[PDB]
């Protein structure tokens, strides 16, 4: 009688990284943190032995007034977000570079008129899901093999000039 059998019952799955170090580049904000969890609880181990480096290097986030659409007094408020960040391989080298945006737009009244000041704030609550879970995606379109080829195509350009030269 062998029962040489384990069970069954995989609902883990594999990506094409498996670590990758969170890091922000001047201070840090939320997007940076929110970021780690969201890779921790995807089944990404975060640390700081990484071979490939996720690094924000800036939050801007755009508070403006669009005025009215017409010769009325309306005039509701837009919110743009912009994350930036880095792949950051070796050598401390950029292998690509990309920032994310979203944009939303706050409901005005008339009788709201103050009310939608104090509102505006109340929607930041939220524009704080916005950023990651389309922050987050690029990362799952990101191959090993675009990141070791943007490192090589990058030493070879870099180290091309210092040839170029005397």
Request: aromatic residues 6%; without cysteine; charged residues 25%.
């Given at each position: 009688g062998?029962?040489?059998?384990?069970?069954r019952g995989?609902?883990?799955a594999?990506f094409?990284?498996?670590?990758?170090?969170?890091?922000a580049?001047?201070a840090?904000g939320?997007?940076?943190?929110?970021?780690?969890?969201?890779?921790e609880?995807?089944?990404?181990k975060?640390?700081s032995?990484?071979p490939?480096?996720?690094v924000?290097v800036?939050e801007?986030?755009?508070?403006?007034?669009?005025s009215?659409?017409g010769?009325a007094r309306?005039?509701?408020?837009?919110?743009t977000?912009t994350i930036?960040?880095e792949?950051?391989?070796?050598?401390?080298?950029?292998?690509m570079?990309?920032?994310v945006?979203?944009?939303?737009?706050?409901?005005h009244?008339?009788?709201n008129?103050?009310?939608s000041?104090?509102?505006?704030?109340?929607?930041?609550?939220e524009?704080?899901?916005d950023?990651i879970?389309?922050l987050?995606?690029r990362?799952?379109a990101l191959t090993?093999?675009?990141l070791?080829?943007a490192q090589?195509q990058?030493?070879?350009?870099?180290?091309?000039?210092?040839?170029?030269?005397?």
């Open positions: 062998t029962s040489g059998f384990q069970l995989l609902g883990d594999q094409a990284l498996k670590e990758i170090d969170v890091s580049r001047n840090y939320p997007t940076v943190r929110e970021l780690k969890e969201t890779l609880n995807s089944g990404v975060v640390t032995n990484a490939y480096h996720l924000l800036r801007d986030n755009q508070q403006r007034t669009v009215y659409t010769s309306g005039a509701e408020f837009e919110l977000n930036n960040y792949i950051v391989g070796a050598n401390d080298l950029v292998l570079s990309n920032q945006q979203v944009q939303k737009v706050y409901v009244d008339e009788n008129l103050i009310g000041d104090q509102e505006a704030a109340q929607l930041r609550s524009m704080r899901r950023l879970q389309q987050s995606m990362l799952q090993p093999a675009q070791d080829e090589r990058a030493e070879a350009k870099a180290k091309a000039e210092a040839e170029a030269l005397r």
